[PDB]
Write an enzyme that holds these catalytic residues in place. Structure first.
Site, mmCIF file in Angstrom:
data_model
loop_
_atom_site.group_PDB
_atom_site.id
_atom_site.type_symbol
_atom_site.label_atom_id
_atom_site.label_comp_id
_atom_site.label_asym_id
_atom_site.label_seq_id
_atom_site.Cartn_x
_atom_site.Cartn_y
_atom_site.Cartn_z
ATOM 1 N N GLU A 121 28.585 5.624 -56.084
ATOM 2 C CA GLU A 121 29.052 5.330 -57.434
ATOM 3 C C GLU A 121 29.254 3.843 -57.657
ATOM 4 O O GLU A 121 29.100 3.366 -58.784
ATOM 5 C CB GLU A 121 30.330 6.118 -57.756
ATOM 6 C CG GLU A 121 31.630 5.363 -57.617
ATOM 7 C CD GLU A 121 32.839 6.178 -58.063
ATOM 8 O OE1 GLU A 121 33.600 5.694 -58.933
ATOM 9 O OE2 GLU A 121 33.047 7.290 -57.542
ATOM 10 N N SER A 178 39.002 0.997 -59.701
ATOM 11 C CA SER A 178 38.397 0.393 -58.526
ATOM 12 C C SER A 178 38.118 -1.072 -58.835
ATOM 13 O O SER A 178 37.665 -1.403 -59.932
ATOM 14 C CB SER A 178 37.081 1.089 -58.153
ATOM 15 O OG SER A 178 37.302 2.412 -57.691
#
Ligand SMILES: Nc1ncnc2c1ncn2[C@@H]1O[C@H](COP(=O)(O)OP(=O)(O)NP(=O)(O)O)[C@@H](O)[C@H]1O
Ligand SMILES: Nc1ncnc2c1ncn2[C@@H]1O[C@H](COP(=O)(O)OP(=O)(O)NP(=O)(O)O)[C@@H](O)[C@H]1O
Ligand SMILES: C[C@H](c1ccc(CC(=O)N2CCN(c3ccc(C#N)nn3)CC2)cc1)C(F)(F)F
Ligand SMILES: C[C@H](c1ccc(CC(=O)N2CCN(c3ccc(C#N)nn3)CC2)cc1)C(F)(F)F
Ligand SMILES: [Mg+2]
Ligand SMILES: [Mg+2]
Lengths: 352, 352
Positions: A121, A178
Site C-alpha cells: 500500500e 502513516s
C-alpha cells in the site's frame, strides 16, 4: 480485460479505471458484450448503486497509458459494501493494494479465473503520487499550497512545482495516519504512524454528536466553536505563556474544559464536532512537524480522504505547520489525494 | 512565616509545606497563635474541607532544609476551589508557579501584605525533580521503572538510579503535555508539547461515559475492552502488516470502529473509558518517542498527575515505549510525580 487498480482501505475502496478512447472499428467488433456493458455502465453513471461515486472532476482526459490513449476515472465506495461489489462481479487481472487486498483475498478469488495481485500500500502510494504529478492534472498543477496561510484576507490556494520532488514527507491520513519519507523514486521508508486519524474524527464525532456521515460531521464542525470544549493557554495563564512563546489562543488541553459539568451541559454538538476536528488535525500536523524535523525534510504533503471536501482541516494544517515551524516547513496538498494507491496499483499491471 | 511552595495548574493546585520539627522551647513561645493554628490544622488533618487532600504516603520525614530539620508535606486541591483557599487565608512570602501564579496574582494580593513571587513552571519542575531525587524518598529510590514490561507474569516495579541524571527527557502530563530536554542543572529547554493530555482523558471520558471523577474514569477503564471501540491493524489487513513490522494487535485508528452505528450501539461505557485512556496514553508515548529520538536522549521520565493512581497508563507507557523503540528507550517514573513544581517553588524561598 479492463484496466483497473484498486486500493481497499479500512474505510473506503478506491478504484482507478482507464477508459480507452482510441478503440478501432475492428477492436469494437472483438469487444465482448459483458465488457461493453461494464464500460458503458461506468462511463454513463456517476452514482453506482446506493454508495458508489465517480469523482468526475478528477478525471484525467486523453492520458497515454501502456501505449493507448484514454481517460482515467476515479471511483470510490465504502469497504463495508465490497461484498456487493464482488457479488456484481460474480454475475481478468486485478492489481490491488491496501489492507483489504490481503483481508479479502479469498473473496476476490470467488470470481472464476480472476488473477489477484497484491501490491504494497505504501509502494503504490508513492508510485501513484509521483505518476499523477508527472502527467499533470489536465495541464494544471496537481500539487498546491495555501499562500499566506496565517492571514485570512490573503490566504489562497496556489500551485506548487514538484518537478524535483525529493526529499518529501508524505502524511497519509486515512483511518489512521502513516508518515513516509521519500528520498528517491526507489528509496522511501515509513517513518512512523499515529492512531489518531480520519477514523478517530468520524468515530468520535458520531459518538459525541450523533452525526451519520463524514459530510454531516464537517457541516456541524463548520458551525462550531472549538474553544467551548478546549482549554486554551489563556484559560490557564490568563494570557500568553511568554517564556516559551506560547500564545494565549493555543490549545493547552483538547476537550479540557469538558471536565466541568456545567460546561458539558452548555456545549453544542457543533462545538464538539469542531473540537474533534481541531484536536485530530493539530495532532496530525504536530506529528508531521516532529517527523519532518527528524528526517530533515522541509516539504510535507498531506494525502488521504480525511481531507476530501475538508478545507477547514487543510487550512488549519497550512496555518499550524507554518506557525509552529516558524516558517521552516510548508504544507502541501494534492488534487487526487485519496486515489494514489489505486493509481499505483494500476501502474503495476505491466509486471503481470 | 510558614514555608510553602505552590504550583497552581489548570486543574490542580499542588502545595508543598515544610513542617519544622526542631522547634526550641523559646521558638514555641515566640510562635504566634495564627501560625500555630495553621501548623496544627495541616498536620492533624488529612482531608481539608471537602476537596483538599494531604498525600501522607509521600511525606519526606526529617529532611534538612534551609538549615532546619522538618517534614515535607504534599497537599493538593482543585484549582476551581482556590477562591475558598484564598478566602480562608484572608480570615508571609508565597513562592508560586504554574499558570495560576499569573492568572490569580491579583487574588493572592487580596491577602494583606502578602508577597507573591511568581516562578517559572518548568524551571520549578526541573529544580524540584532534581532535588527530590537527590534527597531520596526516605532512603528509598525516588525513580523507578517497570522491569520486563512486555511480560505480564514478570513485569514489576524496580528502582532506577538517577545520580547522574543528564541528559533526561521529562514528559509532564498535566491538563496538556509539555516535553522538556534536560542537559544539565542549568541547561534545559521545552522541546514541544501536545494538547492531548490528562484533561483530554478526563473531559472526553466524562462526555462519553458520564463519569464524575478521575478515579471513576479509571475504574471504568479498568473493566473495559478498548478493542471494542478501536480499529486494529488486523481489522484492516486480517493480520499483521508484515512489510512494516506492524503487529495485528496495534491500534490503526483510535475509536475507528465507532464509525459503524451498530458498533456504537453495542459498546459499553467501560470500553469507551478504556479506549480513551489507551488513545491518550499511546499518543503521549509516541510523541515522547519522537522527541527522544530527535533529542538523542534515551531516558524518558513521565511526571504529572495524569499518572497518579494510574498503573494502567504507567504500564502501557512502559510497554509501548520499549516495544516501539525496539528497546532503545526506557520509561521512568517518579514517586512524587505531581509535586515537583511545588517543591521547586519552595526551593526559591532563599532568593527573596
Ligand atoms: N464518504 C466518506 N465516507 C467515509 N469516510 C470518509 C468519506 N469521505 C471522507 N472520509 C474520511 O476519509 C477517511 C478515510 O480515508 P482513506 O484515505 O480512504 O482511508 P482508508 O484507505 O479507507 N483507511 P486505511 O486502511 O487506514 O489506509 C475517513 O476516516 C473519513 O475521515
Ligand atoms: N483528583 C483529581 N482531580 C482531577 N484530575 C486528576 C485528579 N487526579 C488525577 N488527575 C489527572 O491529573 C491531571 C492534572 O495533572 P496536573 O499535573 O496536576 O495538571 P495541572 O498542573 O493542574 N495542569 P497544567 O496547567 O497543564 O500543568 C488531570 O487532567 C487528570 O487527568
Ligand atoms: C504550559 C502548559 C501547556 C501549554 C501548551 C501545550 C500545547 C503545546 O505545547 N502545543 C505546541 C505544539 N502544537 C502544535 C500544533 C500544530 C502543529 C502543526 N502542524 N504543531 N504543533 C500543539 C500545542 C501543552 C501544555 C499549560 F500549562 F499551559 F497547559
Ligand atoms: C497501515 C495503516 C496504519 C497502521 C498502523 C497505524 C498506527 C501506527 O503506525 N502506530 C505506530 C506508532 N505507535 C506508537 C504507540 C506508542 C508509542 C510509545 N511509547 N509509540 N508508537 C502508534 C501506532 C497507522 C496506520 C493501516 F492501514 F493499517 F491502517
Ligand atoms: Mg488507505
Ligand atoms: Mg502543571
Amino acid at each position: 480485460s479492463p484496466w483497473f487498480g484498486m486500493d481497499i482501505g479500512g474505510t473506503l475502496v478506491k478504484l482507478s479505471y482507464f477508459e480507452p478512447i482510441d478503440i478501432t472499428a475492428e477492436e469494437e467488433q472483438e469487444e465482448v458484450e459483458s465488457l461493453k456493458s461494464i464500460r458503458k455502465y461506468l462511463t454513463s453513471n456517476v452514482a453506482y448503486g446506493s454508495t458508489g461515486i465517480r469523482d468526475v472532476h478528477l478525471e484525467l482526459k486523453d492520458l497515454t497509458l501502456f501505449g493507448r490513449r484514454g481517460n482515467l476515472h476515479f471511483i470510490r465506495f465504502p469497504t463495508q459494501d465490497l461484498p456487493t461489489f464482488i457479488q456484481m462481479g460474480r454475475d481478468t487481472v486485478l492489481c490491488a493494494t491496501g489492507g483489504g487486498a490481503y483481508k479479502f483475498e479469498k473473496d476476490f478469488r470467488t470470481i472464476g479465473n480472476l488473477h489477484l495481485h497484491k501490491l504494497d500500500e505504501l509502494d503504490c502510494l508513492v508510485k501513484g503520487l509521483l505518476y499523477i504529478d508527472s502527467v499533470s492534472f489536465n495541464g494544471q498543477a496537481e500539487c498546491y499550497y495555501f499562500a499566506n496561510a496565517s492571514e485570512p484576507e490573503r490566504c489562497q490556494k496556489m500551485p506548487f512545482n514538484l518537478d524535483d520532488p525529493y526529499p518529501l514527507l508524505v502524511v497519509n491520513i486515512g483511518s489512521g495516519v502513516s508518515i513516509l519519507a521519500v528520498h528517491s523514486k526507489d528509496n522511501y521508508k515509513r517513518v512512523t504512524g499515529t492512531s489518531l486519524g480520519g477514523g478517530t474524527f468520524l468515530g468520535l464525532c458520531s459518538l459525541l454528536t450523533g452525526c451519520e456521515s463524514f459530510e454531516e460531521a464537517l457541516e456541524m464542525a463548520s458551525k462550531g466553536d472549538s474553544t467551548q470544549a478546549d482549554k486554551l493557554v489563556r484559560d490557564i495563564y490568563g494570557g500568553d505563556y511568554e517564556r516559551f512563546g506560547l500564545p494565549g489562543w493555543a490549545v493547552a488541553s483538547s476537550f479540557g474544559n469538558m471536565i466541568y459539568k456545567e460546561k458539558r451541559e452548555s456545549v453544542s454538538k457543533e462545538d464538539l464536532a469542531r473540537a474533534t476536528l481541531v484536536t485530530i488535525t493539530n495532532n496530525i500536523g504536530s506529528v508531521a512537524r516532529m517527523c519532518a524535523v527528524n528526517e530533515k525534510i522541509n516539504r510535507v504533503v498531506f494525502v488521504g480522504n480525511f481531507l476530501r471536501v475538508n478545507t477547514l482541516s487543510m487550512k488549519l494544517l497550512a496555518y499550524a505547520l507554518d506557525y509552529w515551524s516558524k516558517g521552516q516547513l510548508k504544507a502541501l496538498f494534492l488534487e487526487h489525494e485519496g486515489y494514489f494507491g489505486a493509481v499505483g496499483a494500476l501502474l503495476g499491471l505491466p509486471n503481470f
